[PDB]
Design a binder for these strands. Structure first.
Lengths: 366, 732, 732, 133
DNA sequence: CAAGACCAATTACACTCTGTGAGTATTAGATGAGCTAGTTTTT
């Protein structure tokens, strides 16, 4: 699609950035006080204020603009219809597996690459007089100057709602290059965010060789992306990715299988066992479900209290329903693609039956 | 025996996977481009299997550098054949040296012991990747494997629209490939000597002629295929629909003592064929399919247990599909292609197996027509068939004509199971409120039918977390549960409701059941036609009858009219005179000017008298609507019919009035006061003609129709919106 | 335009005549050779009209020295156009001189010419004679008449199966032949100068370029056709089903302002088309047909009263036929070709105009399938549809599988009117004996129904003479008239006849009505299914239903069975135990060996108990059959059902026995005692399977079926005999 | 490709019912701009000069176009149609005309094509081949 | 560290010279309430 001035007049800035358009006012950038800087580990998440024009502009961009730009089929994340199961599905046909991760994927995306990627889809015309164009007006609502990273340019925040679509759009040249390189050598390539999974069906040591890593690094160096050696995994006939086990016994066309290890399902089994042992709900959610009431309970306004029991009923029901949704998403993926172990299927059927029984018990108790 | 065909980023396929293939797989749909692209993909894959220089297929989008075609073969029969000890043959060893060799030598002495239980199935996957630089490579880098796969599972394409009768290339190819005889042991010299001995005026006369002919036409030696073709031609005594049927029979017969499993694709088998010819073709295919089948008690020579080759059809004729469903049964499937919103072919399996034998046996052209549809409206009743197939109404709405109206009860709906094919063939089930709730005058209480309780149970969203917006469903379910109270007072001898309104309940039920593709009307089908706003037009319709369908019986009209006037009073005895003068007659003779004026005056007087009597006997101006509704087999707001009211002994005075009008005043309309009498068609035609005469623009006509018929026009507009929402998908 | 086409002694036509051509003509039939030969005849006639050297057509038989092709043209509109004083152009005078001048000089102007100026129509007959020496003779000995007829009533043939999308020659030819503009007034030099002035600077460069091009090429000058085609191509902004629709639309649009009335013949308009596409094609044709109609009050700009060109369709699809019927009505006809006994093409008209608007709107694929049929079996009831469409029964009778069964009442039969096309489509109407004779229990009376009286009136040999071959028709009619009496008193409380037999009366009625294509059954279809000979098979079916229908309601079978045995007696209280243990269920779980043995013993005991009770309750092995018939909505020999007996009040004890059996003994079979319950299909399938298991050869199976089912096998064999007697004609 | 085009002429398998190379050369080898010319004025003039009253031919063309649903001509097709209208004309003669046209067109342009003629003497008298050369 | 491999999509001859691709040369019922929020991946 192509976005001209009139499109931005009443679609992406219908009400928010309207007063600036009429009164010959350049659209401002994002101020420091307009964002929060939350922390989790050694990671910084930029949270934009909900009541802000930039948030509305980002929502309209993600609904109308950043939803029609073509992407690469290897991008299985942040795309309507993409999923982790679809990210792991194509590798069932391979015998050798390799996993790579791009280090600081969102922080290493140069703003010039984003500008050059979004230029073909935005008309190169001035918006607010002969002061500001239309491309930079769109970009001002996407990026943010990070005080932590000094004056190194407009770094794409890791918490903005427009970040995933922009990342997938800008990582299309690299996706095409890597896909072509793997096609020339018979390697199946799939990317989820910044995890790249490569599968080789043939009996070769290409994925375990340093040449493959060197080629991937050389390709990624075009746009300035590196890969950390901490989580480089090269294995044969079996690979575990965050509990998802892909296993192929090998051959000349044998079909692999995808299952989930007991480590992935350990928490739900512990919860079900605790429910079987009639453990009180006080310590089944503050230990297993890592959900707990804060000290500032009942907003420091009510006096009835007693909300702890109903909270520990509600949140437990929600957790059981969500994990049930996860398991039945797995079984529907199996029905659609037929790449899941039968014993794992019967095991998750039994677990689903147990979860349904426990949900019925909890709802009867309330 | 393929089990999976996957196409990614080629032609019109983004990611399309085909599975659960059967013997008589049939392909239908308006997206002929999709069928052509699938056939091109299959032909390209099988050409690249045999190493033929062909143009690579185009990508669906250029933002992908890879185009994949994945074929999965069920190598279970072949593995069992080659694994057995008593199969020490060169070809058997060749098969168990390239396919089932890499997966056996690399395993220990435990894995294979679980593969001899005669219960597991073996799959062989082969992937063709087309790169951006027009370079094609395979998952397995062994041409022997590809050649063996092509030989074991060949692909045959038969085109009937462009078929040459003189050339029998597929027949001779099948004969040469499918044989169990070695022709290398035949001595050409011995055969020539035998021929010479057969025709010999002297010893050694044909030999010199043969030598001279060979010398004067000396060319390249015959190949094995040419030799076997010539031997078959001299061995046999003989060289559109008949050609294809013979080819299919030959292929089926040959594939009875061979482990080769061919794949047959036939495009448009019914071009230039009578429907009986297509039905006979499918019947002959089923006969040859069943003749070579042995099941338990069925045994003896001539019957085999060899799996049948997969046959693919591309048919636009409902006859072939109907016969395939009726005869084959569980050994067939129907694949609908259609398209997507952005433009991309889909493949969905349409329900073709029915658990009811009666439905399968009485399966007809309408049921096969439902599969060649883009929107099906399921109705219970022939009156709805009359109303929604009215030609005079469809021309004003050139979007509901694309929808097909089907009369089906609950059993037929369950057999068809439209929910299985929902994204391919959108459907709406139109029913009445009486199928959900029921009312009793003697016990003044609502009751819930099992259908409504089943729908509620289906809509109970248990085993669910908390999400925004999905909070009022539980409240609606609770309200639909608690409306079962007995507090509902009925006035007018149990005909109306004092405070309750079924309009709001019907609207709420429709709102909650929109997601289940069901629409429930407030009243019966006659309710939407006979309403208050339709009272004038309906009355005019009655007048039309009095002016059209009833003519003078006597051959001399003037004398009879004069005698009746001098004998019967024109004012007090007007009804007996009208009954004795006008009768039922299709012809409309033209009388004298005075006679015509007298007849018109009498008709106008009778119309005025009936209008005055109707307005005087009933005062509320609404009870007449209910009376007319119950006259034509309708229902009240209490969900009671005239017969049910008669059996329950309710509204005795109302039934007496209805009887008086039927047997005294509206006696000429008695034949039309029954269902399936065609009164709906006549009333709609007359109303539409009158509105067209009054209003000029078609938009005004549609607005007037919406005013007079709110529910019918609402349903039509909803169906039209549903069709136009997916117009770009269900259209070639 | 055209009235009659007569072919004598050419191709497959002996004395074939086609008449009564409408705006739309649909050609259907199983004899494609006849349609091809008719097309060849038309094309040869129109080629000889334009003086084209073509090979003469072959004679039907060489024992005839002459082959005639006769064409009659309705020269009424053109005669009125050329006769009018206002029109005095060169072409009008030429038309008057070459056609309407020879016939005018022979008629007196004072009287004959004045009389002929009325609503009467004028026709022009032209005959082409082919002799043995390949010589062509014409009725008119001047080429001018033939040339003017060719250029005034042109013939256009469109073949869709073999069509070129890149070729527009028919379209350009038609456009050039349908122009009323004189292109000779356009100056080439002025156009070239205008182009040169507005192409570039230095006026004259384009002129020099064109001069060089024409000096180098130097070909023959463009003809009028080429010049008008080029002018149209430049003037327009741009240039299978789409091409045909566009050509037809432009032809209809361009013929509104011209007196030329062409004849269009389209062969296979549905090749490679979805049924919806064919319906849309017919709908667009009807829309463009009705857009240019000016009749009655419909007037205004864009409306024309010119007659539409005749269009012929060679269709094998019911969709096109049904759309044509429903959309045109009186402006269409259906032609059936078939063959003769010795081999010769026929042309008959099948009824397509219906006086009932309800039938026209309801018209669907099932109704359109009757046109493409060789034998129709008309039945009243869905049970007969279930029986006659049974796949197992039709497998043993391949001949009856060629006949299609339609469910029609008397109104549908009257609308279809099968008697109009008897030779083209043979038919039989299967009805029950209660539509002829009426019986009452209260008063002994064999009343005659109006249908029977109508049949008697039709068979009354009034206005007739002697010399009747065989059959005392008058005696039979008299006996049928006097059968109305008060005899044949009741037996067993209005359930049988003391001495009267309905079998003989049914046989006599069938013998009389064989010529009426009507067959009347002795009893309803239930009586034909379950009779005194099929009781063992019905009992075996009941036993099989008991064995494989009910299961254990309790999840634990052994504990529940033990508890019920310890609670309920196994002999005296066997019925309560059976009711409380076995329940109807689709699933059939497998139990333990002891549980299975106990269940089998209980089922065998129940079967023995029911058999003993049936034998010891009813009198003989005749009341069981009547009881079972009335259970499944049947009739007795007095033409009474259970509902009618209840409304009357006869045979109260037998009704109580039936109620006791249904509510207590046979309660699992209660849901299957409805007409729309599918019990017929299940019973027929079980009987066929059992007979196949017992006997070996198919002839023995057919003999057993004839013994068990006399009436069904009799009617099937009669229909098969009729089909095989008239199979040569109704087969391509 | 557009500066050194390649042409192939097979005289043995040539067809006299089509002029594809000639029209291709005419469309590709031109120094004019068949874009200033507008369809409206062309039609208007044809209607004014054809017959009957004013606007009748324009209405005929409009009603033909509105019911045909055809994509507009490309530049090559449009210039081919214009040349066909502007001219008064439609084995050895065909080849000679093609070569003469190509030479005449290539005498005022910097495009230098390359022609390959296969079997220029099939079905020709020796005098005819000498006359061709 | 530093790196080859950096996506795809976005009918035409002006010129004085009418033939040439320079030469010049033209030329100018509004006031107690009172409430939570799924699994998993990226991270």
């Amino acid at each position: 699609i192509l976005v001209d001035k009139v499109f931005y007049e009443k679609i992406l800035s219908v009400e928010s950035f309207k007063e600036n358009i009429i009164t010959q006012s350049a659209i401002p950038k994002i101020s420091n006080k307009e964002v929060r800087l939350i922390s989790s580990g050694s990671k910084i998440f930029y949270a934009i204020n909900n009541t802000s024009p930039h948030s509305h502009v980002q929502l309209r961009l993600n609904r109308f603009f950043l939803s029609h730009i073509p992407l690469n089929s290897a991008a299985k994340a942040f795309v309507r219809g993409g999923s982790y199961l679809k990210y792991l599905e194509p590798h069932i046909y391979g015998s050798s597996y390799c996993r790579l991760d791009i280090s600081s994927f969102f922080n290493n995306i140069s703003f010039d690459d984003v500008k050059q990627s979004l230029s073909p889809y935005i008309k190169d015309e001035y918006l607010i007089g002969t002061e500001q164009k239309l491309i930079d007006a769109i970009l001002n609502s996407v990026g943010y100057e990070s005080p932590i990273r000094k004056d190194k340019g407009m770094i794409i925040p890791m918490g903005f709602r427009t970040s995933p679509a922009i990342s997938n759009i800008v990582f299309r040249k690299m996706d095409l290059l890597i896909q072509d390189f793997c096609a020339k050598k018979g390697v199946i390539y799939s990317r989820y965010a910044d995890d790249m999974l490569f599968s080789n069906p043939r009996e070769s040591k290409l994925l375990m060789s340093d040449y493959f890593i060197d080629e991937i690094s050389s390709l990624l160096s075009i746009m300035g992306f590196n890969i950390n050696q901490s989580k480089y995994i090269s294995r044969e006939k079996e690979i575990s990715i965050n509990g998802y086990v892909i296993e192929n016994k090998g051959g000349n066309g044998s079909i692999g299988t995808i299952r989930l290890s007991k480590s992935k399902l350990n928490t739900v089994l512990k919860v079900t066992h605790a429910l079987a042992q009639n453990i009180p709900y006080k310590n089944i959610c503050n230990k297993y479900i890592k959900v707990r009431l804060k000290e500032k309970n009942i907003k420091y306004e009510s006096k009835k209290d007693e909300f702890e029991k109903k909270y520990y009923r509600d949140q437990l029901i929600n957790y059981l329903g969500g994990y049930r949704s996860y398991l039945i998403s797995l079984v529907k993926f199996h029905s659609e693609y037929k790449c899941v172990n039968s014993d794992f299927i019967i095991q998750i059927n039994g677990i689903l039956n147990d979860i349904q029984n426990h949900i019925q018990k909890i709802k009867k108790n309330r | 025996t393929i089990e999976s065909i996957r196409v990614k980023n080629l032609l019109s396929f983004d990611d399309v996977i085909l599975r659960d293939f059967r013997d008589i797989n049939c392909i239908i749909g308006r997206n002929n481009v999709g069928k052509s692209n699938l056939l091109k993909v299959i032909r390209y894959f099988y050409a690249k299997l045999e190493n033929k220089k062909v143009i690579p297929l185009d990508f669906h989008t250029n933002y992908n550098a890879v185009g994949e075609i994945t074929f999965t073969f069920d190598t279970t029969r072949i593995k069992k054949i080659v694994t057995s000890r008593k199969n020490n043959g060169r070809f058997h060893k060749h098969i168990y040296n390239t396919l089932f060799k890499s997966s056996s030598v690399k395993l220990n002495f435990e894995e294979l012991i679980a593969r001899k239980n005669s219960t597991n199935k073996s799959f062989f996957s082969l992937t063709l990747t087309i790169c951006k630089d027009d370079s094609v490579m395979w998952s397995v880098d062994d041409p022997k494997v590809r050649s063996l796969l092509a030989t074991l599972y060949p692909f045959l394409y038969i085109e009937t629209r462009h078929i040459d009768l003189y050339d029998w290339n597929p027949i001779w190819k099948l004969i040469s490939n499918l044989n169990s005889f070695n022709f290398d042991d035949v001595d050409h010299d011995e055969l020539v000597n035998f021929l010479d001995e057969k025709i010999s005026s002297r010893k050694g006369d044909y030999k010199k002629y043969i030598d001279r002919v060979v010398s004067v036409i000396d060319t390249k030696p015959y190949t094995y295929k040419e030799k076997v073709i010539n031997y078959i031609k001299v061995a046999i005594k003989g060289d559109s629909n008949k050609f294809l049927e013979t080819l299919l029979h030959l292929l089926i017969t040959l594939t009875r003592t061979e482990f080769i499993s061919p794949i047959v694709y036939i495009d448009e088998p019914e071009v230039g064929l009578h429907p009986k010819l297509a039905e006979s073709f499918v019947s002959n295919l089923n006969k040859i399919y069943s003749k070579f089948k042995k099941t338990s008690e069925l045994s003896g020579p001539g019957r085999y247990k060899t799996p049948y080759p997969n046959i693919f059809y591309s048919t636009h004729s409902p006859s072939i599909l109907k016969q395939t469903i009726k005869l084959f049964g569980k050994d067939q499937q129907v694949l609908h292609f259609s398209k997507k919103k952005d433009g991309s072919t889909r493949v969905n399996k349409i329900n073709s197996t029915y658990s009811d034998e009666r439905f399968l046996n009485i399966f007809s052209d309408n049921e096969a027509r439902l599969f060649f549809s883009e929107y099906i409206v399921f109705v219970e009743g022939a009156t709805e068939l009359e109303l929604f197939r009215n030609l005079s109404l469809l021309n004003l709405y050139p979007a509901f004509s694309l929808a097909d109206i089907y009369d089906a009860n609950e059993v037929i709906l369950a057999n068809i199971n439209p929910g299985y094919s929902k994204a391919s063939i959108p459907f709406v089930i139109i029913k009445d409120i009486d199928t959900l709730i029921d009312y009793s005058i003697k016990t003044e209480k609502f009751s819930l039918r099992p259908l409504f309780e089943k729908m509620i149970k289906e809509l109970t969203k248990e085993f669910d977390y908390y999400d925004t917006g999905f909070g009022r469903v539980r409240k609606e379910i609770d309200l639909f549960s608690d409306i079962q109270s007995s507090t509902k007072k009925h006035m007018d001898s149990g005909l109306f409701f004092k405070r309750f309104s079924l309009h709001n309940l019907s609207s709420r039920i429709n709102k909650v059941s929109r997601k289940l593709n069901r629409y429930f009307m407030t009243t019966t089908i006659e309710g939407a036609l006979i309403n208050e706003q339709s009272l004038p037009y309906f009355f005019n319709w009655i007048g039309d009858v009095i002016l059209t369908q009833m003519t003078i019986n006597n051959p001399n009209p003037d004398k009879f009219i004069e005698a009746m006037r001098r004998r019967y009073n024109i004012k007090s005895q007007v009804v007996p005179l009208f009954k004795s003068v006008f009768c039922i007659g299709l012809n409309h003779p033209v009388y004298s000017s005075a006679v015509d004026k007298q007849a018109l005056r009498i008709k106008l007087s009778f119309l005025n008298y009936l209008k005055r009597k109707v307005y005087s006997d009933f005062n509320n101006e609404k009870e007449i609507v209910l009376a007319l509704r119950l006259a034509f087999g309708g229902k009240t707001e209490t969900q009671y019919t005239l017969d049910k009211l008669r059996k329950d002994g309710e509204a005795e005075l109302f039934r007496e009035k209805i009887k008086n009008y039927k047997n005294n005043e509206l006696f000429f309309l008695e034949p039309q006061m029954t269902k399936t009498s065609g009164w709906v068609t006549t009333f709609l035609n007359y109303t539409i003609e009158k509105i067209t005469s009054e209003e000029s623009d078609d938009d005004r006509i549609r607005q007037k129709l919406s005013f007079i018929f709110p529910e019918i026009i609402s349903i039509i507009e909803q169906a039209s919106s549903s069709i136009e929402a997916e117009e770009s998908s269900l259209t070639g």
